[PDB]
Every structure is written in C-alpha cells, then in structure tokens.
UniProtKB/Swiss-Prot annotation:
Glycosylated; with approximately 10 hexose residues per site. It comes from Zea mays (Maize). Its main location: secreted. Its EC number is 1.5.99.12. FAD binds at F68, G70, R71, G72, S74, Q78, E137, T142, S148, I152, I203, Y455, S491, Q494. Residues 33-213 form the FAD-binding PCMH-type domain. Expressed in immature kernels and unpollinated cobs. Weakly expressed in kernels harvested two weeks after anthesis. Competitive inhibition by phenylureas. Gene3D superfamilies: 3.30.465.10, FAD-linked oxidases, C-terminal domain, Uridine Diphospho-n-acetylenolpyruvylglucosamine Reductase, domain 2. This is Cytokinin dehydrogenase 1. Belongs to the oxygen-dependent FAD-linked oxidoreductase family. The modification Pros-8alpha-FAD histidine is found at H73. Catalyzes the oxidation of cytokinins, a family of N(6)-substituted adenine derivatives that are plant hormones, where the substituent is an isopentenyl group. Cleaves trans-zeatin, N(6)-dimethylallyladenine (isopentenyladenine), isopentenyladenosine, zeatin riboside and cis-zeatin, but not dihydrozeatin, kinetin and benzylaminopurine. Trans-zeatin binds at E137, E345, S420.
C-alpha cells in the first residue's frame, strides 16, 4: 500500500524501473563492483525527496534501501542501493528557475544545491568575483557527495577540508523531515552529516564559505631525490606561523618510481622534454629509485604590481627550501585553469579509452611520525619493479583545521599525510594484481603498527568500521544513526549498517 505523494512520483514518471534507468544507477567510477537497484528516482524538487523518505518512514516493513547518486564517483559501490531506490540527484538541477547556485548579497558565502557540481559552483562564484577556499583536485563531483566524505586538496592545510568550510545545510533526514542545520541550529545533525557517508540524510543545500576570487596562480614544481628533505619542506610550507600560515595557497606532492620516470614526468603535463631529461639525469647521478616533487601555488589578482610581488614572495619562500639546486620549475595560469586542471587529464584518457577502466585506488591518512616508514616500505619497497599507471600523491594536512566532532575520521597526530595512489587498471587483466598489492600495502602498515585512516574506502566488517571511527566516536555515529535513520535504509553501499 503506497502513500498518495509516493504514487504521484510514479504517475509523473519520476520513479523508473526500466532497464536503462537501473543499469545507469548500477555502476560507478571504481568500475569494480556493480549492483542493480529496483528503481531510480529523478526528483524535480526537494518535495519529491520528502515524499520518498516519509513513505519509507511511515510504511511498516518498508524493504527498499535508498542511495543518493551525486555523479557516482564512488570507488566501491557507496552510491548503490542493491534492489532498492537510487536517487538521481542531478534531476534537482534541471529547471532554469529556481536557481540552484546563489552567491550571497554580501559576497561572504555561496548557496549551492546538494546535487550541484563544484565546476558550476566555481563558474557561478567567479561571475560574482568570489570562489570557495577549499577544493577537491577534480571539479566534476557534487557538493553533497564531497561533503559526505571530507573534500581534500592542497588548500586543506590552511583552510581545512571542504567539510570545515560549510556555514549551514538543508538536510532531509531518514524520517523525511526537512531540517536546516549549523553549529547554532540542530548542531548534532550538521556534525553527523559532514563526513557522514550519506548515512543520516540527503543534503539538499550547502552554504559554502567564499573568499575574493584570485585571477591567477603562480604554479611551481620543486624536485627532490631525498624523501626526508621533500617531507621536511612540505611540512615547512604548511606549518602554522608563530593561526597564520606561509604564503602558499596550495601545497601537494608526488612520487615518481624510477622504472617509468621519463614517461611519468612527461605525463604530468607540467614538465617540458628538456625538464624531463634534467630530472632523469639527476636520478641517475643520485642513483635514486624514487624521485619526489613538491607541487605548490601562489594565488594573485589582476593588480599592476602583482606579478613582481609574486616573483619576490616566491623567491623568498624558495630560499627557505632544500630542493636540488636549480630544480625549481614555474608556470603561470588563470585561477580557473589551475582549479580545472584534472578535467584535461579526463579528456585525454577518455579518448585513449583509459578513463572508463577499473580504479583500484588506495587513499589513506598516514600520521607524520610514520610517513618515512611508509615511503621505505611502499614507494621504495612494494611498488618497486612494477609498471605504475596513475599518480602517487603525498601531502601533509594540519589536524587543527579538522573538526573531530564531525563524522570524518582522521589520525590523532597534529600533522598527517593524505596518501593517494591512483592506480588505473589499464593493462589487459591487471585488476587482480592491483587489488592484491593494495591488500599488501595495508598489511605492511598493520604489521608496522602505523595508525592510518582510510579515505573513500568502505569496509565490509563491523570491527573495521569500529577501528575506522575509534570506539568512542563509533558509539556517537550509532547514536546519530538511531536518531536520523533508525530503519537503516540510507546509503547501504557504505556497508556500515547494511
Ligand atoms: C572519481 C574521482 C573522485 C575524487 C577525485 C577525482 C576523481 C576523478 N578527487 C578527489 C579529491 O581530490 N579530493 C577528495 O576529497 N575526493 C576526491 N574524489 C572522491 C569524491 O569526493 C568521492 O567520489 C565522493 O563520493 C563524491 O562523489 P559524488 O559527488 O559523485 O558522490 P557519489 O559517489 O555519487 O556518492 C558518495 C556517497 O555520498 C552519498 N551522497 C551523495 N550525494 C549526497 C547528498 N547530496 N546528501 C547526502 N549524501 C549524499 C551517496 O549516497 C554515497 O553513499
Ligand atoms: C632506473 O630504471 C632504469 C630502467 O628504465 C634502469 O636503467 C636500465 O638498467 C638496466 C640494468 O643495468 C640496463 O640494461 C638498461 O639498458 C637501462 N635502461 C635505460 C633506459 O637506461 C636503472 O638501473 C634504474 N636505476 C635504479 C637506481 O634502479
Ligand atoms: C583524494 C583524491 C582521490 C584525489 C584525486 N585526484 C586526482 N584524480 C584523478 N586524477 C588526477 N590527476 C591528478 N590528480 C588526480
Ligand atoms: C566497467 O566498465 C566497462 C566499460 O564501460 C563495462 O563493460 C563494465 O560493465 C563495468 N563493470 C563494472 C563492474 O561496473
Ligand atoms: C536561490 O534563490 C532563489 C530565490 O532567488 C530560491 O527560490 C532558491 O531556492 C535558491 N537556491 C538555493 C540552492 O538555495
Ligand atoms: C644504487 O642503488 C641500488 C638500489 O638501491 C643498489 O643496488 C646499488 O648498491 C647502488 N649503487 C651504488 C654504486 O651505490
């Protein structure tokens, strides 16, 4: 027996069971796992979301799990609702009116629908001379999707993750109740939802902090053959000054294994063939099995004196560093071209047929005290003698910029590294080898007693999720699940309560 508001969605053709609808909502970016839903909802408004979730809340014995598909960038089925209902979030942004992205009158924040993609949040913000302060490396992800994880990039050391740059949200709980939440209003829901893995409700609107939009980014790469010098410099560039930070707007880093060195440097799209020859000769001279590169930017505007001020500011910061003499490499681009840089890698890989392939990505947070051990056992150990396809990203984060009361789990140390090994299974049937190598890396960290946290991964065992949050923080997560999704129907693909 269906409620009238739920039956109206099927009448209006918003609730589909056809093979085309279910097939599209059954695969994700990871391209490793698949799960067909029973139905797909294409909501035209937030009232359609209220109708589905209230039906779920009031119907006794309701058997359908519900997932909120952003862009399906999930790696291991986190956006699937096996034999359930997948919400096609993008349908909320179909009409020309009402607008889904509103920059505030005062220009201090930006209101964006949960379904909206960060690239559109950027374009709408830039039209009003503003931009969010904390980003992901890839802009074709949804506001609600990244906020359900953390949302990290080279800006998070100073501005914190995307979850630390949200003023307020509109959420529809598992009870079908539309609640506006912040630190001052319904704080418990606001904190549970940020990094909440879609467990407590759907974010329909997020109010994102903005800053005056820079016009350009001075973009640098610094080369090292010594991991200790590389990691020490990343920490210097990202350390809090004796609340204040250094001038860098973005700090990331990358690891290049010797075996494929020339090809990998040439594939960054940053280095010229002359730059490549020099770094390859440097590696041979130092007899390095690994090469490290700091990637950093300095944001600046259209002011007449800006270019010279940046040259001086950059010359000053570089003098404090310990990269191999003469191995500083500069580029200067428009701010939006820098932010949207990964979209170019997508275009080039898609035409080669190397984008829509399995992505057995390994993403983790490694405490600073164990990063050199990780480098020895992984970059200089396990990954040696292998053909790597995908970037190996390493960069420090400041725990002070993360709110531990939110759902997102991080290591206890003040400084911890985001470690992103973006393996693409390009070779014929290389998937099984990559999945085993990820199990080996994790086993190496477990045996060495490294207290890491995974990021973007879903655990399949209860004991793993309990260790992921930590026992006390886990009990708190359960408290919020009981309050907001007692029926355990939301985002079943996380495998926390399903
Ligand atoms: C594929 C990809 C992912 C990625 C990235 C680059 C690429 C090519 N770069 C990232 C980066 O630099 N930093 C970062 O923190 N994450 C990065 N990612 C991962 C990305 O954040 C995740 O894939 C995330 O899931 C966002 O993707 P998407 O927007 O496509 O969301 P989804 O996969 O469909 O769903 C994820 C889970 O969240 C729940 N969900 C989705 N939308 C909502 C809303 N509006 N409200 C509540 N929950 C929501 C889903 O149910 C699912 O469980
Ligand atoms: C870095 O990797 C390269 C392979 O690209 C190694 O260079 C090869 O080494 C073997 C063994 O002496 C030679 O037979 C090949 O002809 C070399 N190839 C090229 C393209 O130069 C090199 O040994 C590696 N360095 C380290 C420190 O492992
Ligand atoms: C945290 C995370 C998975 C970041 C991913 N970033 C990227 N994802 C995919 N391709 C990339 N190239 C450079 N950076 C890339
Ligand atoms: C992965 O993508 C390929 C090519 O688009 C497709 O044939 C296959 O169904 C996908 N597999 C999974 C498990 O999603
Ligand atoms: C944007 O503002 C309009 C009013 O101008 C409103 O109807 C709409 O709900 C807003 N969109 C978001 C995402 O807040
Ligand atoms: C170069 O480094 C390799 C790999 O670590 C090692 O086998 C070899 O002893 C080194 N050669 C010299 C001359 O140090």
């Amino acid at each position: 027996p269906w409620p009238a508001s739920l039956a109206a969605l099927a009448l209006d053709g918003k609730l589909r069971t056809d093979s085309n609808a279910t097939a599209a909502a059954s695969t994700d970016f990871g391209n490793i796992t698949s799960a067909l839903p029973a139905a797909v909802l294409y909501p035209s408004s937030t009232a359609d979301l209220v109708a589905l979730l209230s039906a779920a809340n009031s119907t006794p014995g309701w058997p359908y799990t519900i997932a909120f598909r952003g862009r399906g960038h999930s790696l291991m089925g986190q956006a699937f609702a096996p034999g359930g209902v997948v919400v096609n979030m993008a349908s909320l942004g179909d009409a020309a009116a009402p607008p889904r992205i509103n920059v505030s009158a005062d220009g201090r924040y930006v209101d964006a629908g949960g379904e909206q993609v960060w690239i559109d949040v950027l374009r709408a913000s830039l039209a009003r001379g503003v931009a969010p302060r904390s980003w992901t490396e890839y802009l074709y992800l949804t506001v609600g999707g990244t906020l359900s994880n953390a949302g990290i990039s080279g800006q998070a050391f100073r501005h914190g993750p995307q979850i630390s740059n949200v003023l307020e949200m509109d959420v529809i709980t598992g009870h079908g109740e539309m609640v506006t939440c912040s630190k001052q209003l319904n704080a418990d829901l606001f904190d549970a939802v940020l990094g909440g893995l879609g467990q407590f409700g759907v974010i329909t609107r997020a109010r994102i902090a903005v800053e005056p939009a820079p016009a350009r980014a001075r973009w640098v790469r610094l080369v090292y053959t010594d991991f200790a010098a590389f990691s020490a410099d990343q920490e210097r560039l990202t350390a809090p000054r004796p609340a204040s930070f250094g001038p860098m707007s973005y700090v990331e880093g990358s690891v290049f294994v010797n075996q494929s060195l020339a090809t990998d440097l040439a594939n960054t799209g940053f280095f010229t063939d002359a730059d490549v020859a020099r770094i390859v000769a440097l590696a041979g001279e130092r007899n390095a099995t690994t090469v490290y590169s700091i990637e950093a930017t300095l944001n600046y505007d259209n002011a007449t004196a800006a270019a010279a001020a940046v040259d001086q500011e950059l010359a000053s910061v570089l003098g404090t560093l310990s990269y191999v003499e003469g191995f500083a490499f500069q580029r200067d681009v428009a701010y939006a071209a820098f932010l949207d840089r990964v979209h170019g890698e997508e275009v080039a890989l898609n035409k080669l047929g190397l984008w829509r392939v399995p992505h057995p990505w390994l993403n983790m947070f490694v405490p600073r005290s164990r990063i050199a051990d990780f480098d020895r056992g992984v970059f200089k150990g396990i990954l040696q003698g292998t053909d790597i396809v995908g970037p190996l990203i390493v960069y420090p984060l400041n725990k002070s910029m993360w709110d531990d009361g939110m759902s997102a789990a991080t290591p206890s140390e003040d400084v911890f590294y985001a470690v992103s090994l973006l393996f693409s299974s390009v070779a014929p049937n290389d998937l099984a080898r990559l999945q085993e190598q990820n199990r080996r890396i994790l086993r190496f960290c477990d045996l060495a007693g490294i207290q890491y946290k995974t990021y973007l991964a879903r655990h399949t065992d209860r004991s793993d999720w309990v260790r992921h949050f930590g026992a006390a923080k886990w009990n708190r997560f359960v408290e919020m699940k009981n309050k907001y999704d007692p029926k355990r129907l939301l985002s079943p693909g996380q495998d926390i309560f399903n």
